[PDB]
Amino acid sequence: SLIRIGHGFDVHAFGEDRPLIIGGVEVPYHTGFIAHSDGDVALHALTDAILGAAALGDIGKLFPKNADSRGLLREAFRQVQEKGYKIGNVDITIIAQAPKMRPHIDAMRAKIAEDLQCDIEQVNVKATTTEKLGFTGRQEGIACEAVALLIRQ
Amino acid sequence: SLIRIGHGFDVHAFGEDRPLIIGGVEVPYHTGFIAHSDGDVALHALTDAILGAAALGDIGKLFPNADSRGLLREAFRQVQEKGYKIGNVDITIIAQAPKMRPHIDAMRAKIAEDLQCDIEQVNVKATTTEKLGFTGRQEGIACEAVALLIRQ
Amino acid sequence: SLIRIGHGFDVHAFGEDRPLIIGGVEVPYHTGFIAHSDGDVALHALTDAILGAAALGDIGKLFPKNADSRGLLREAFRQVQEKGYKIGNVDITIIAQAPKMRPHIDAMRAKIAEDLQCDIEQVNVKATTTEKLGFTGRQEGIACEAVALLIRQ
Ligand SMILES: [Mn+2]
Ligand SMILES: [Mn+2]
Ligand SMILES: [Mn+2]
């Protein structure tokens, strides 16, 4: 096509890591959901949005490591380009029961702009809350939604 | 306009049936939300997104029935009447379930068939909420969808 | 860029007031989330999507008035308009455990069509429930999803 739209959604449940001594041996004990990523909800959702607009499925097909989400994002963009697309613009909506992120937003945009090889003017990020409601409101984790518009370069 | 965008969100809450003997007669008893469809959250959301992009309201403004594919075709036909065809659609199933990947392409083929477009204009993905929220507690499933329509 | 895509999400948690007598004085007592707006999730989500498409951040950057969401929405359109954008079309999905809202949907579309200086035909509003599930299903609040397509004017 000449223009494609994609959508992404992701959640990160909060988990904790604590050291324990079992059988005289120091071992790591993980509490909460077992993550297989850095939990970067904004990049995971954004990554699913771009792959989806190009009909490439989802983040779960980028490498048949995963600890780094910018690596996954680049790999997705690499593949999107292979199909002839470049970024039109993307918009990300972080859903968290948190306040101060604006100082960090622009930094996020730049990083995303860098990995998608586009201007920062094509990347928007925002954060909003659920006003103490739901799992994000009770602070059990965070979520993120993202939309992307692809164009033929 | 020659290019339209639309969005859909849908939820299906799990419910169950069980037989009961009351007054010497067996009667069916339903537990949970009463369903009025096959519960296909992906097609319902997709339908809303397509109807939404054309400013045709939503699934509720179709038949003033249970098979979601019929609703989906009805929505596409109405979007055709206005002169649109599918640019591309992207579906995101939100459920606390494992393997659906084996059935994804089957889903894409049927959606492509109903929207009279190529399977390549259709994307379907499934993600989880990592045991959080009503989908995480497995009380039901949800789905979000976006659709881009192009002027025919 | 000739076409821009945007996304918005908003939630409004319910809160009731109750007058009391303290120190022989009457004072209003608030229960629940402290509201800072009229709680119009539809216009807030819409506002975030329009600004998000133009990479203007979010609704919380407009007026550094908040008691009226249309004011904020018209302001948002003003700024997108300054970057040379006009509405392509917008689609809004209100998520609430409520029924009778259809009779008011067209009235909403007209007001939105007015603040976005476009035709009502370019504005869609739909409503759905979560079938008694989640915080909206338990009736603790309401939510709204929004996407916007901006076109170069
Ligand atoms: Mn995930
Ligand atoms: Mn439903
Ligand atoms: Mn809010």
Which residues of A contribute to the annotated binding site? Answer: 10-12, 36-37, 44, 58-60, 63-64, 128-131, 135-138
**Resolution, rounded to a tenth of an Å?**
2.3
Q: A137, A16, C45: which is closest to B133 by C-alpha?
A: A137
Q: From the CA of A55, how many Å to the nearest CA of chain B?
A: 5
Residues with CB under 5 A from ligand 1 (ion): A 10
* CB contact (8 A) between residue A33 and residue B133: no
* CB contact (8 A) between residue C13 and residue A128: no
Cα angle: B62, vertex B65, B68; to 5 degrees: 90
Q: Is A78 helix (H, G, I), strand (E, B) or coil?
A: helix
Task: Yes or no: say if B9 and B147 are a contact pair by the CB < 8 Å rule.
Answer: no
A147 CB near a chain B CB, below 8 Å? yes
Residue of C36, C83, C135, C145 to mutate, interface with A, max A Cβ within 10 Å:
C135
B106 CB near a chain C CB, below 8 Å? no
Task: Yes or no: say if A139 and A97 are a contact pair by the CB < 8 Å rule.
Answer: yes
Determine the distance separating the centroid of ligand 1 and the alpha carbon of B71, expressed in angstroms.
30
* CB contact (8 A) between residue C13 and residue A132: yes
* CB contact (8 A) between residue B5 and residue C89: yes
Give CA–CA dist A60/B120, Å, rounded: 18
Task: Yes or no: say if C90 and C116 are a contact pair by the CB < 8 Å rule.
Answer: yes
User: What ranges in B82-148 are assigned the alpha helix state H?
Assistant: 101-114, 133-136
Please report how the helices A41-53 and A69-82 are oriented relative to each other, as an axis angle in degrees rounded to 10.
Answer: 10
* CB contact (8 A) between residue C10 and residue A128: yes
CATH class of B1-152: alpha beta
Cα angle: A132, vertex C52, A95; to 5 degrees: 20
Give CA–CA dist A49/A118, Å, rounded: 16
Determine the distance separating the centroid of ligand 1 and the alpha carbon of C136, expressed in angstroms.
23
Pull the structure tokens for residue B13.
Answer: 């809450």
Q: B63 labelled as ligand-binding?
A: yes
Handedness of CA B32, B36, B37, B43 (dihedral sign): negative
Measured CA to CA in angstroms, residue C87 lies from A50, B78, C40, C41 at distances of: 23, 23, 20, 20
A14 CB near a chain B CB, below 8 Å? no
Quickly tell me which residue has 């959640």 as its tokens.
Answer: A11
* CB contact (8 A) between residue A9 and residue B144: yes
Give CA–CA dist C130/B11, Å, rounded: 5
Give CA–CA dist B63/B56, Å, rounded: 13
Residue of B4, B9, B14, B56 to mutate, interface with C, max C Cβ within 10 Å:
B9
What lies within 8 Å, CB to CB, of B93 at 6+ separation is B41, B42, B100, B124, B125, B126, B127, B141, B142, B143
HEC letters along C69-131 = HHHHHHHHHHHHHHCCEEEEEEEEEEECCCCCCHHHHHHHHHHHHHHCCCCHHHEEEEEECCC
Tell me which DSSP letter residue B34 carries.
Answer: P
Pull the structure tokens for residue B32.
Answer: 């949970």
Give CA–CA dist B6/C149, Å, rounded: 9
What lies within 8 Å, CB to CB, of C22 at 6+ separation is none
Residue of A131, A132, A138, A144 to mutate, interface with C, max C Cβ within 10 Å:
A131
C52 CB near a chain A CB, below 8 Å? yes
Domain ranges of chain A: 1-153
Q: C11, C31, C10: which is closest to C20 by C-alpha?
A: C31
Q: C10 labelled as ligand-binding?
A: yes
Give CA–CA dist A93/C42, Å, rounded: 16
Q: From the CA of B123, how many Å to the nearest CA of chain C?
A: 18
Q: Which amino acid is at B126?
A: A
Residue-wise DSSP of A109-143: HHHHHHHTTS-GGGEEEEEE--TT-HHHHTTSEEE
Task: Yes or no: say if B61 and B54 are a contact pair by the CB < 8 Å rule.
Answer: no
Task: Yes or no: say if C6 and C55 are a contact pair by the CB < 8 Å rule.
Answer: no
Spacing of C-alpha B43 from chain mean position: 2
Q: C129, A143, C138: which is closest to B128 by C-alpha?
A: A143
What lies within 8 Å, CB to CB, of C112 at 6+ separation is C43, C46, C73, C90, C92, C123, C125
How many Cβ pairs within 8 Å bridge chains B and C? 88
Query: Which candidate from A9, A13, A54 shows the least CB-CB separation from B92?
Result: A9
* CB contact (8 A) between residue C55 and residue A124: yes
Q: Which amino acid is at A10?
A: D
In chain C, the N- to C-terminal Cα span, in Å, equals 11
The chains in contact with chain B, meaning 3 or more Cβ pairs closer than 8 Å, are A, C
Residue C124 pairs in a beta bridge with C91
Residue A19 pairs in a beta bridge with A28
Task: Yes or no: say if C39 and C50 are a contact pair by the CB < 8 Å rule.
Answer: no
Q: For domain A1-153, is the CATH number 3.40.50.2000?
A: no
Q: A 109-138 residues with CB below 8 A of B? A: 134-135
In chain A, the N- to C-terminal Cα span, in Å, equals 11
